[PDB]
């Protein structure tokens, strides 16, 4: 007998390999004077759990709809209480059997009534700029068609279906479809109509598409202009006017403009233009720039550029894939404020409004097609859509719509086929189509390392070492001599590098030095701009970001989606502050004698005339001198030495020895720009006169012995433990050696290579570093000075079930006012476990104080955190912060907040102040212990316990980027060693 | 200056390598007529966290004691609210730096006042039978000495210190000491005075020690008797009387008793004897037996024996290491009731009272010395006390006290040097001392595989395969020809095997067959007798067992201490019921034609005269015939064929075909024994006439089609899912294929060997077997019979992110009364993941019923659970249990309760009854889902949800012993395959 199952037809369509049906030809997104009506607003919405249960109750007619409630459109509907967001990284959340879909498939029925006036007749269309993942569209009950390609635009002719007056638009949206198999980006799965819905009139004698060709001849200064215009796919008579250039020309003819000012990210010159036919006029912004690959270099307007980039997803912590325009504008301004000049639209085209902002503010853009089949990799790429002939039309269509929509924007300097889609016939077809359609932009795609169908060689997270070999052109050959010759002639880009998850990223400086040294290196794009945190509100009302698994997912990838330089609300992480410094476009090297500074202009086109150069000398008491210096403009890629005013050097020469003083030279905007105000800091450099080494106090005070306690000046010691119980009145609950920290996200990633691929966090756990214990060996007093004495406490630190340890000796000294503490660490037995060497996170001390800290001040680096392979943006100076603001609000709490390179510190314990001095140490102050920090999965898990946890580290490990990419570089690793270091302590009430 | 730390002297003593000081010579535990006073009772107790804080406040004088509270003695003090028990398996809970102790070291001060009458003067002693781990003893403020060796006895002379009238006994007990390094058994760390404290008078002209030598000459039947007696270490004139043997002899002379009845575990003949001098008489029980190794066989009284053994720890779920005598007696009786004949005192000497019970009830005992340095293995045995000359005196002393205390007991047939202590000089010294002192008992020690200093070759958890090679004497040679020749001449024992943790142990039968086949194989001792569960009581008042980590331990090993054949309260696990059958001492093979049975006497000394042989024929209606048969006694190791009464065969011949009937033949005690009552079952065998295969119902009923539902007889199907929603009125919430079960403890252990060492539980998790999903492919009806039709539902089962799946087709048939269900499974793509083949736990169905089940009945195997490599004790029959009693109360909930080999089943869902028939299937019924079972860490985590979860399995995996030892044997593994199987269903209201 026949079939008896329900919904076979809906499901047959969802499983289709075809692109959408019924849509108009793909075209550019154009600003037109044609009437248009946004249908955005409050729609009606009904959710069904699958296609077999989705009602076929004539709901498209909008009459007697039961089960519908209001929903804003555009929206990601799980951000509004309908289902829940779900995060997977690589793994598909459904069985991998393309093109088939699971039974649990949220079906969202959307409906809106609207009014169409006579200006939309006789011809109009409906435009949808994004539907995830499969839409079926009805107007007044007549099926317009379907949509495939979730971040791509679709237009439907409504001529003869749209009626004057009231109309009813209905859209059935399936979360999962065959397209889901090619939309496996590392991000939240979020169904919805998440971009604009527009009704546009199409008057007769209008303009459907426009293709701007605006080249630049850097030898003559000429612009090369051709503006194509078409209607129904045929070239049409149109007039092109560019008033600023005194130009009137016909569409379709190439002309040479005698002297144009060229467009670049540094100088994003745009000329306002209009293309007009009888019934319609289109407004354009034209930036003249030519892109070329020459001598294995990526060049714009005749010059090799340096990409200073980020990977930009579209995410909002409360609206999902809907990013309000005001947030877009602000975040692009924030990027420019941190010296970013390039953006990759990972991994799909952005909102169409994005490109004009990129044109205007100035970014080199890698516009990527909506294609990613990452989940097929684990099966050896079996059934990969990228190589399956049945998917060719679907994938070419994705590329076509990507290219057509954005082809007029100067800011787009590369087209990208997709991301992590393997290699295959359909990728080659997408490349062939793009090269024929638009030869003016090189093609990018990292998935095929042979680079057979691209114009640049692209890699993700290649090590600093391999990048140096590539920059010199000495990487190993491809097996195919012809392909090897082609790839060696290509410039090289890191489409993703220095993974910015949690504490980090480390190793940015070593990449950047290579970028500057080797012309073949185009630069790199950080993974990634933002964390995809989703706001969650508790009963108390306290908000925190959630991540994978916080929404009930059966399969998920945890906090791997919170991996950005800013949080979901665009608050910078420390890594962004470091990144801005690393990529700063000018290098300022201040002379040790304070007589001047060397200034290198790292820009590619602009000189230094936009910048005001300012100097300031700061000391303990505050600013001693400051001013501005006149710098004759320095050409791009040129260098000069600038004399500073004689007062600065003279000031340096007059400082008594050991008095600390910091000279800072800054390059700030002389005037407001489109992205920041005058005085915004772009680059800086410093020369420091360091404070003298701290003088051990004279051991003049003796030790008082008592039954259970010992006193030495202001320090009171427990006689049973040997550690101090109070010092200057401030209670000390515990003092001991530390070798471990609460693992970062990087420490949770695998150290690939060698026989040991355990994450460092696991190595540490296996080794017992998280659970150290101390045995007291002895306490003795020894002859000091003029009757005084030192107190030596000998301990051994180890962990249960381990034979290795470190002997630790504390030697205390005091003159009644200052406390001298020498600490001496010595290995006892080999620190090897499970057959591998144990590494340390740190060599330091943990003071646990029985009172709360309100304020932390220090002299060293700041204001933000710094670790051995980070902190580039932390500058030398004097800093003071409330305790709450020493912490870093990572979504998963982890080690953070250390201030490396500190020379002195003051903790304000209410009425008293504790001072620490010493040779350079790292400083951390927290109101909770390391075990609470490690145990915490979200920030509300952190609770202050009334104490102060003070960490003084003589040595620190780097943080690296091991969550994805290289671990800590050799020079920053911390292997077990012997070590001795001195501190002074003082309590000033 | 001098030291300033506190408690250095106490700690210096705890770190001492010496044995105890001040104690009398080690001697036997003897029953004497000398006056004795137990000091057991309510003592006063004070706990301090370490030696540096333990008061030196003159507390030993018992006057003005502050901070003391009542505590029972004997006790493990963490079982009474003072600190907490802590469980570690191998790892030490302190840093490994012998002989040093951690700062956190519970110090327990014990004190008791008592009255000593004139019968304890002039000479008396104080006896301590166990202190964990280091005791210091004062009497009336005078230091008697110290104790080392936590499960060993110490006696102190109190002559001249004990006063007539009131006395004050004070004992300072440290949990940790240098001895802790040699007491690293896999068990709870439990400090305390955990065995008897006795005041014993020592009258003049008494007897301090006695050494019984009672040999047996199996050729002549003669006993060989010599009883040594000494005082102050010198041989003394004593008289030895043995009334039953008409003997009066002098101590110290060897005599030949003409005809003794020899002692064995099977026939534990004991002769009452008394050794007496003028001032003291000692009562003895003498069992005559000679032990010998001959022709690579372990022999007793001239014959090779088979050890049917368990490893017996001393544990009580509420008293710790204190085992009440009534529990000891009951558990030994329970052992005999399950055919056990041998006990290893893992891994220390037991309570001294244990040995006379072993003598009397009849066990071959391996008495092990208190020595285990397991925690040194992870460092390559660096610093192992067993090879460190500084520990020689400590370790010889442990062996000396072990041997001296128990040397008079016939039940001790082997001395063991210790457990998991590596190899070393001190072990060799312990062996040398023992061989010189007592050559009558072979020496055992598994730690040194070369067997250089032992008389038997011992291994733990050697595979069934390696055991078969050893039994044939073809294992590989040692590199030292001399040592190889010695070891090849040795018999072989598995001191630990078939690890009994959780569901299991599997593979017992394959070991046992080898034991019977190969004389060199002595048998084996199961690890272990009991689970060390500790009772925990919640606010509700519900008790459950806790394990490692349930008491706040920083380092622990979880539920690896709950790994026994009985729970902590001695309730049998299914593995014990299986074990009893596996080791049954008689083999009964019932003839297929029911005319008789073959009977092999597997005993070593006894014939079959103790046994009554009974038969019974059972059918659906109940017993059809039964009686007793007279078996002329069968000699040990002999065989005969016993005719059954003609009525039984005649009954068999008269059964209509397909009618099920079970013939059972049982060997029960003819009369009460010391360990069970008459009628206790010892062995059994069965012959079954199986029920006919179930007849598919005639497909005479058609399918009614409806908008959303389908009806076929009494089955109602959801049209959207294809699965039934009710059947006979009972609601069905879900039906689907299962391939996975909630991992057992064995499934959580590593499959050593191959490139894949992930535990099967992890293999499953990585593969998605725990999270299967089903896609509906189609539903169609097809021509049945006389207008009826079948309904076929086609599905595919897979998991998210996986390409492999199984196609499943359900074909339904009904004649209105019975429902026929054919299920057909077919692999689609290779079930490979992470580069390794995925194995299945099962091929079955899960019915989730929307109503509760009160009663489960079946015909198959029972009453207890059975899996492919277990269930030996489950016999064929008809069974019925309430739902609660289908479950197995393992401490960590896990897969359990399957009844393999079922042919029919009836679930009573209140007023209705669901019947299932089919070819052999496994049956499981639960009131909670598999995910709740897996998630649960303790039994209170299980919660009934109102449903019934019914599992019908066409195939099951074995359970093995992978938690420690071999995994599932090849023949019981379940690799992916195609499969088809049929069921019938019927609801009788
Ligand atoms: O956050 C990781 C980002 O990097 C890439 O994904 C990573 C791949 C690259 O082959 O390596 C892993 O670490 C393996 O799991 C991936 O996470 C993606 O291109 C980015 O979209 C993003 O996921
Ligand atoms: O419950 C395990 C029992 O077996 C032995 O310990 C195991 C050793 C044998 O070398 O192998 C391990 O599985 C490794 O961890 C141990 O658990 C002990 O002899 C027994 O006392 C007991 O622990
Ligand atoms: O503690 C005295 C013991 O005497 C033992 O036997 C004598 C010892 C004394 O050196 O040496 C022997 O040869 C035994 O090895 C005997 O002559 C007793 O057997 C012990 O029980 C005990 O009495
Ligand atoms: Na165990």
Q: What is the DSSP secondary-structure string of B540-609?
A: S--EEEE-TTTT--SS--GGGG--SSB-TT-PBPHHHHHHHHHT-SEEEEE-TTSSEEEEEE--SS--ST
Tokens of B308: 């049917």
Residue B61 φ/ψ, nearest 5 degrees: -80, -5
Tokens of B498: 């078939």
* CATH class of residue range B293-580: alpha beta
Residue A477 φ/ψ, nearest 5 degrees: -75, 150
Separation between Cα atoms, residue A97 and residue B665, nearest integer Å: 56
Q: Which of B1, B5, B383 sits opposite A722 (nearest CB)?
A: B5
**Quick one: B395 exposed, middle or buried, by C-beta within 10 A (0-12, 13-18, 19+)?**
buried
Q: What is the strand order of the sheet A124-128 is part of? A: A36-38, A197-201, A124-128, A154-157
Residue B988 φ/ψ, nearest 5 degrees: -105, 110
| Contact at CB, A722 and B379, closer than 8 angstroms | no
Q: Please report residues of B whose CB lies closer than 8 A to that of A52.
A: 720-721, 776
Whole-number Cα distances in Å, A837 to A76, A760, A827, A832, B97: 49, 11, 13, 4, 19
Q: Could you tell me if A804 and A689 are in contact, meaning their C-beta atoms sit under 8 angstroms apart?
A: no
Q: Please report residues of A whose CB lies closer than 8 A to that of B4.
A: 703, 705, 710, 719, 779-781
Q: Which residues line ligand 2 (CB under 6 A)?
A: B 89-90, 186, 346-347, 419-420, 460, 496, 527, 560, 563, 964
Q: Of the ligands numbered here, which is closest to the C-alpha atom of B437?
A: 3
Q: Could you tell me if B547 and B534 are in contact, meaning their C-beta atoms sit under 8 angstroms apart?
A: yes
Q: How many CB atoms lie within 10 A of CB B165?
A: 10
Q: What angle do CA B419, B422, B428 make, to 5 degrees?
A: 90
Tokens of A199: 């009704």
SS3 B510: helix
Distance from CA of A837 to the nearest CA of B (A): 13
| Contact at CB, A95 and B799, closer than 8 angstroms | yes
* DSSP label at residue A425: H
H or E, element range at A209: strand A209-217
Separation between Cα atoms, residue B969 and residue B960, nearest integer Å: 7
A608's CB contacts (< 8 A; 6+ apart) are: A586, A599, A601, A631, A633, A634, A667
Q: Please report residues of B whose CB lies closer than 8 A to that of A7.
A: 720
Whole-number Cα distances in Å, A426 to A176, A404, A421: 22, 18, 10
Torsion of CA A670, A673, A675, A680, to 10 degrees: 10
Tokens of B677: 């009552």
Whole-number Cα distances in Å, A539 to A543, A544, A548, A940, B548: 10, 12, 21, 12, 35
The Å distance, Cα B272 to ligand 3 centre, comes to 23
| Contact at CB, B1 and A776, closer than 8 angstroms | no
Handedness of CA A84, A89, A91, A92 (dihedral sign): positive
Query: Best of B315, B371, B500, B527 to mutate for ligand 2, by most ligand atoms within 8 A of CB?
Result: B527
Q: Could you tell me if A101 and A112 are in contact, meaning their C-beta atoms sit under 8 angstroms apart?
A: no
Q: Could you tell me if B349 and B151 are in contact, meaning their C-beta atoms sit under 8 angstroms apart?
A: yes
User: Quick one: residue A22, left, alpha or beta (phi over 0 = left, psi -120 to 50 = alpha)?
Assistant: left
- The 10 Å CB-count burial string (b at 16+, else e) for A233-251 is eeebebebebeebeeebeb
Separation between Cα atoms, residue B438 and residue B967, nearest integer Å: 40
Handedness of CA B227, B232, B234, B239 (dihedral sign): negative
Tokens of A161: 């279906």
Separation between Cα atoms, residue A769 and residue A779, nearest integer Å: 25
Q: Could you tell me if B594 and B663 are in contact, meaning their C-beta atoms sit under 8 angstroms apart?
A: yes
C-alpha neighbours within 13 Å on the C-beta side of residue B43: 27
Instruction: Judge if the beta carbon of residue A377 lies within 6 A of ligand 1.
Output: no
- Strand pairing category for A307-311 and A342-344: parallel
Separation between Cα atoms, residue B91 and residue A767, nearest integer Å: 12
Separation between Cα atoms, residue A832 and residue A830, nearest integer Å: 6
**Quick one: A266 exposed, middle or buried, by C-beta within 10 A (0-12, 13-18, 19+)?**
middle
Length of chain A: 989
Q: Could you tell me if A953 and A898 are in contact, meaning their C-beta atoms sit under 8 angstroms apart?
A: yes
Tokens of A480: 């195919």
| Contact at CB, A383 and B803, closer than 8 angstroms | yes
Whole-number Cα distances in Å, B321 to A98, A607, B69, B129, B132: 62, 84, 21, 12, 10
* DSSP label at residue B151: T
The Å distance, Cα A964 to ligand 1 centre, comes to 7
Q: Could you tell me if B191 and B79 are in contact, meaning their C-beta atoms sit under 8 angstroms apart?
A: no
* DSSP label at residue B336: H
Query: Chain B residue closest to A705 (CA)?
Result: B4
Separation between Cα atoms, residue B853 and residue A867, nearest integer Å: 62
Separation between Cα atoms, residue B276 and residue B240, nearest integer Å: 7
Q: Could you tell me if B738 and B950 are in contact, meaning their C-beta atoms sit under 8 angstroms apart?
A: no
The per-residue DSSP string of A598-653 comes to EEEE--SS--STTEEEEEEEEETTEEEEEEEE--PPPPTT-EEEEEPPHHHHHHHH
Tokens of A769: 């570093």
Tokens of B260: 């003794």
**Quick one: B292 exposed, middle or buried, by C-beta within 10 A (0-12, 13-18, 19+)?**
middle
Whole-number Cα distances in Å, A69 to A45, A57, A135, B562: 5, 16, 19, 56
Separation between Cα atoms, residue A272 and residue A294, nearest integer Å: 31
A646's CB contacts (< 8 A; 6+ apart) are: none
Task: With CA atoms as reference, report the closest residue to A789 among A701, A889, A685.
Answer: A701
Tokens of A284: 């354009």
Q: Could you tell me if A4 and B708 are in contact, meaning their C-beta atoms sit under 8 angstroms apart?
A: no
Task: With CA atoms as reference, report the closest residue to A46 among A73, A71, A76.
Answer: A71
Task: With CA atoms as reference, report the closest residue to A897 among A932, A930, A926.
Answer: A926
Tokens of B7: 């408690």
Q: How many CB atoms lie within 10 A of CB A593?
A: 12
Whole-number Cα distances in Å, A878 to A861, A885, A906, B199: 8, 16, 11, 75
C-alpha neighbours within 13 Å on the C-beta side of residue A62: 18
Report which ligand 2 atom has the smallest distance to the Cα of B561: 1
Q: What angle do CA A680, A686, A688 make, to 5 degrees?
A: 145
Separation between Cα atoms, residue B526 and residue B343, nearest integer Å: 9
Tokens of B591: 């003839």
Taking the CA atoms of chain B, what radius of gyration do you get in angstroms? Answer: 32
Q: Which of A88, A94, A801 sits opposite B96 (nearest CB)?
A: A801
Separation between Cα atoms, residue A662 and residue A903, nearest integer Å: 13
Q: Could you tell me if A952 and A983 are in contact, meaning their C-beta atoms sit under 8 angstroms apart?
A: yes
Query: Best of A366, A375, A420 to mutate for ligand 1, by most ligand atoms within 8 A of CB?
Result: A420
E strand intervals along B52-139: 69-73, 86-88, 107-116, 124-128, 131-132, 134-139
Separation between Cα atoms, residue A166 and residue B223, nearest integer Å: 117
Q: What angle do CA B174, B177, B178 make, to 5 degrees?
A: 165
B863's CB contacts (< 8 A; 6+ apart) are: B874, B879, B881
C-alpha neighbours within 13 Å on the C-beta side of residue A844: 25
Separation between Cα atoms, residue A334 and residue A351, nearest integer Å: 18
Task: With CA atoms as reference, report the closest residue to A34 among A283, A325, A211.
Answer: A283
H or E, element range at B357: helix B354-361
SS3 B404: helix
Instruction: Judge if the beta carbon of residue A448 lies within 6 A of ligand 1.
Output: no
C-alpha neighbours within 13 Å on the C-beta side of residue A919: 9
* DSSP label at residue B221: T
Q: Please report residues of B whose CB lies closer than 8 A to that of A712.
A: none
Report which ligand 1 atom has the smallest distance to the Cα of A419: 19
Q: Could you tell me if B681 and B666 are in contact, meaning their C-beta atoms sit under 8 angstroms apart?
A: yes
- The 10 Å CB-count burial string (b at 16+, else e) for B67-83 is ebeebbbbbbbbbbebb
A496's CB contacts (< 8 A; 6+ apart) are: A311, A346, A446, A460, A461, A524, A525, A526, A527, A528
Separation between Cα atoms, residue A116 and residue A102, nearest integer Å: 39
Q: Could you tell me if B270 and B263 are in contact, meaning their C-beta atoms sit under 8 angstroms apart?
A: yes
The Å distance, Cα B789 to ligand 1 centre, comes to 53
Q: How many CB atoms lie within 10 A of CB A539?
A: 5
Q: Which CATH architecture has domain B703-988?
A: Distorted Sandwich (2.70)
Tokens of A75: 């929206």
| Contact at CB, A781 and B4, closer than 8 angstroms | yes
C-alpha neighbours within 13 Å on the C-beta side of residue A792: 15
| Residue nearest atom 23 of ligand 3, based on CA coordinates | B230
Separation between Cα atoms, residue A922 and residue A860, nearest integer Å: 9
Query: Chain B residue closest to A91 (CA)?
Result: B801
Q: Could you tell me if B301 and B264 are in contact, meaning their C-beta atoms sit under 8 angstroms apart?
A: yes
Q: Which of B2, B6, B93 sits opposite A719 (nearest CB)?
A: B6
Separation between Cα atoms, residue B321 and residue B304, nearest integer Å: 35
Query: Chain B residue closest to A773 (CA)?
Result: B95
Q: How many CB atoms lie within 10 A of CB B577?
A: 19
A252's CB contacts (< 8 A; 6+ apart) are: A226, A227, A228, A229, A235, A238
Q: Please report residues of A whose CB lies closer than 8 A to that of B705.
A: 4
Q: Which of A2, A720, A771 sits opposite B52 (nearest CB)?
A: A720
Separation between Cα atoms, residue B426 and residue B386, nearest integer Å: 5
B420's CB contacts (< 8 A; 6+ apart) are: B184, B347, B372, B373, B374, B377, B446, B447
Separation between Cα atoms, residue A456 and residue A451, nearest integer Å: 7
| Contact at CB, A554 and B800, closer than 8 angstroms | yes
* DSSP label at residue A221: T
Q: Which residue has the tokens 């950005």?
A: A564
The Å distance, Cα A969 to ligand 1 centre, comes to 20
Separation between Cα atoms, residue A986 and residue A729, nearest integer Å: 11
SS3 B399: helix
Q: Could you tell me if A183 and A346 are in contact, meaning their C-beta atoms sit under 8 angstroms apart?
A: no
A662's CB contacts (< 8 A; 6+ apart) are: A617, A618, A619, A686, A687, A688, A689, A876, A877
Task: With CA atoms as reference, report the closest residue to A832 among A975, A979, A978.
Answer: A975
Taking the CA atoms of chain A, what radius of gyration do you get in angstroms? Answer: 32
Separation between Cα atoms, residue B776 and residue A51, nearest integer Å: 12
B412's CB contacts (< 8 A; 6+ apart) are: B355, B358, B365, B367, B406, B441
Q: Could you tell me if A359 and A411 are in contact, meaning their C-beta atoms sit under 8 angstroms apart?
A: yes
Q: Could you tell me if A625 and A600 are in contact, meaning their C-beta atoms sit under 8 angstroms apart?
A: no
Q: Could you tell me if B769 and B841 are in contact, meaning their C-beta atoms sit under 8 angstroms apart?
A: yes
Separation between Cα atoms, residue A156 and residue A161, nearest integer Å: 11
Q: Could you tell me if A955 and A974 are in contact, meaning their C-beta atoms sit under 8 angstroms apart?
A: yes
Residue A380 C-alpha from the chain's centroid: 30
Give which of A95, A718, A725 to mutate to test B binding, by max B Cβ within 10 Å.
A95
Q: Could you tell me if B809 and B792 are in contact, meaning their C-beta atoms sit under 8 angstroms apart?
A: yes
A97's CB contacts (< 8 A; 6+ apart) are: B775, B796, B798, B803, B805
Q: What angle do CA B494, B499, B504 make, to 5 degrees?
A: 130
The Å distance, Cα A81 to ligand 4 centre, comes to 49
Distance from CA of B898 to the nearest CA of A (A): 27
Q: What angle do CA A603, A605, A611 make, to 5 degrees?
A: 60
| Contact at CB, B554 and A800, closer than 8 angstroms | yes
**Max Cα-Cα span within chain B:** 109
Query: Chain A residue closest to B92 (CA)?
Result: A801
Q: Could you tell me if A919 and A972 are in contact, meaning their C-beta atoms sit under 8 angstroms apart?
A: no
Tokens of B110: 């014990």
Residue B337 C-alpha from the chain's centroid: 14
Q: Say what the resolution is, in angstroms.
A: 2.0
Q: Which residue has the tokens 């006169």?
A: A689
Q: Of the ligands numbered here, which is closest to the C-alpha atom of B313?
A: 2
The Å distance, Cα B450 to ligand 2 centre, comes to 20
Q: Which of B6, B88, B375 sits opposite A720 (nearest CB)?
A: B6
Query: Best of B372, B420, B501, B557 to mutate for ligand 2, by most ligand atoms within 8 A of CB?
Result: B420
- Strand pairing category for B134-139 and B165-174: antiparallel
Q: Which residues pair with B705 in a beta bridge?
A: B710
| Residue nearest atom 21 of ligand 2, based on CA coordinates | B186
SS3 B245: helix
């Amino acid at each position: 007998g026949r079939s008896l199952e329900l919904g076979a037809a809906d499901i047959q369509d969802l499983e289709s390999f075809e692109a959408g049906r019924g849509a108009l030809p793909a075209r550019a997104y154009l600003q037109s004077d044609a009437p248009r009506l946004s249908l955005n607003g409050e729609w009606q919405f009904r959710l069904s759990p699958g296609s077999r249960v989705a009602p076929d109750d004539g709901w498209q007619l909008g009459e007697a709809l039961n089960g519908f409630e209001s929903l804003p459109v555009p929206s990601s509907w799980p951000m509004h209480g309908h289902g829940a967001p779900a995060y997977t990284n690589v793994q598909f959340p459904f069985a991998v059997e393309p093109p088939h879909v699971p039974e649990a498939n949220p079906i969202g029925d959307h409906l809106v009534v609207f009014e169409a006036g006579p200006e939309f007749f006789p011809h109009a269309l409906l435009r949808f700029d994004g539907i995830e993942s499969a839409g079926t569209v009805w107007l007044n009950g007549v099926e317009l068609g379907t949509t495939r390609g979730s971040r791509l635009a679709h237009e439907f002719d409504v001529s003869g279906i749209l009626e004057q007056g009231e109309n009813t638009l209905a859209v059935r949206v399936a979360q999962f479809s065959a397209a889901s198999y090619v939309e496996d980006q590392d991000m939240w799965w979020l169904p919805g109509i998440f971009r604009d819905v527009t009704l546009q009139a199409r008057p007769a004698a209008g303009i459907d598409d426009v293709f701007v060709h605006a080249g630049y001849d850097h030898i003559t200064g000429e612009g090369i202009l051709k503006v194509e215009a078409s209607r129904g796919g045929q070239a049409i008579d149109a007039v092109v006017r560019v008033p600023e250039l005194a130009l009137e020309l016909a569409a379709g003819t190439e002309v040479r403009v005698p002297a144009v000012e060229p467009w670049s990210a540094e100088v994003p010159k745009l000329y306002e233009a209009a293309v007009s036919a009888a019934g319609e006029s289109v407004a354009l912004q034209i930036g003249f720039r030519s892109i070329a690959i020459e001598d294995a270099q990526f060049k714009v307007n005749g010059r090799r550029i340096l990409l200073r980039g980020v990977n930009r997803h579209e995410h909002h912590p409360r609206l999902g894939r809907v990013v309000p325009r005001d947030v877009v504008e602000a975040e692009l301004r924030l990027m420019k404020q941190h010296n970013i000049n390039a953006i990759r639209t990972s991994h799909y085209p952005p909102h169409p409004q994005f490109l004009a902002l990129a044109d205007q503010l100035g970014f080199y853009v890698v516009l990527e097609c909506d294609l990613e089949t990452h989940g097929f990799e684990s099966a050896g790429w079996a059934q990969n859509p990228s190589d399956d002939p049945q998917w060719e039309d679907a994938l070419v269509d994705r590329m076509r719509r990507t290219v057509e929509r954005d082809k007029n924007h100067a800011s787009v300097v590369m087209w990208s086929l997709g991301n992590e889609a393997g290699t295959g016939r359909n990728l080659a077809a997408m490349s062939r189509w793009t090269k024929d359609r638009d030869p003016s932009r090189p093609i990018h795609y990292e998935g095929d390392w042979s680079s057979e169908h691209v114009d640049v060689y692209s890699r993700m997270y290649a090590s600093q070492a391999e990048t140096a070999l590539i920059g010199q052109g000495i990487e190993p050959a491809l097996n195919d001599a012809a392909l090897d010759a082609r790839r060696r002639a290509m410039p090289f880009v890191l489409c993703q590098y220095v993974h910015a998850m949690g504490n980090g990223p480390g190793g940015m400086s070593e990449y950047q030095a290579l970028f500057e040294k080797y012309p073949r290196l185009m630069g790199g794009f950080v993974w990634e701009w933002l964390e995809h945190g989703i706001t969650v509100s508790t009963a108390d009302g306290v908000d925190h970001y959630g991540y994978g698994g916080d929404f009930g997912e059966e399969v998920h990838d945890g906090n791997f989606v919170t991996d950005g330089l800013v949080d979901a609300d665009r608050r910078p992480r420390p890594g962004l502050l470091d990144f801005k410094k690393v990529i700063e476009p000018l290098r300022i090297d201040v002379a040790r004698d304070w007589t001047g500074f060397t200034l290198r202009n790292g820009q590619d086109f602009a000189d230094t005339s936009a910048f005001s150069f300012r100097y300031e000398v700061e000391a303990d008491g505050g600013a001693l001198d400051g001013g501005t210096v006149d710098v004759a403009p320095v050409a791009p890629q040129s260098e000069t030495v600038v004399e500073l005013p004689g007062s600065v050097a003279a000031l340096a020469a007059g400082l008594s020895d050991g008095r600390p003083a910091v000279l800072t030279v800054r390059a700030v905007l002389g005037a407001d720009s489109a992205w920041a105000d005058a005085g915004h800091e772009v680059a800086w450099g410093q020369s420091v006169r360091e404070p003298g080494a701290p003088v051990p106090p004279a051991p003049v005070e003796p030790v008082q012995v008592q039954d259970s306690e010992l006193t030495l000046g202001p320090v009171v010691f427990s006689r049973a433990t040997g550690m101090p119980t109070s010092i200057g009145g401030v209670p000390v609950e515990k003092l001991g050696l530390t070798l471990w920290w609460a693992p970062t996200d990087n420490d949770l990633g695998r150290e690939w290579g060698g026989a040991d691929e355990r994450p460092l966090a696991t190595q540490w756990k296996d080794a017992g570093l998280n659970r150290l214990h101390t045995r007291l060996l002895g306490i003795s007093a020894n002859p000091g000075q003029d009757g005084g004495e030192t107190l030596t406490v000998r301990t051994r630190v180890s962990a249960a079930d381990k034979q290795y340890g470190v002997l630790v000796d504390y030697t205390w000294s005091t003159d009644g006012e200052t406390v001298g503490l020498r600490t001496q660490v010595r290995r006892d037995g080999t620190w090897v476990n499970r057959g591998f060497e144990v590494e340390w996170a740190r060599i330091g001390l943990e003071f646990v104080l029985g009172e709360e800290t309100e304020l932390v001040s220090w002299f060293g680096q700041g204001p933000h955190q710094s670790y051995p392979d980070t902190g580039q943006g932390a500058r030398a100076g004097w800093f003071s912060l409330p305790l709450a603001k020493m912490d870093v609000e990572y979504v998963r709490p982890q080690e953070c907040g250390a201030r490396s390179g500190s020379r002195s510190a003051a903790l304000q314990l209410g009425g008293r102040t504790l001072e620490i001095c010493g040779d350079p140490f790292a400083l951390t102050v927290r109101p909770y212990s390391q075990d609470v920090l490690d145990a915490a999965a979200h920030r509300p898990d952190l609770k202050a316990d009334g104490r102060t946890y003070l960490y003084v580290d003589h040595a620190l490990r780097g943080v690296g980027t091991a969550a994805c990419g290289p671990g800590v570089l050799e020079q920053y690793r911390l292997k077990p060693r012997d070590a001795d270091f001195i501190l002074t302590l003082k309590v000033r009430s």
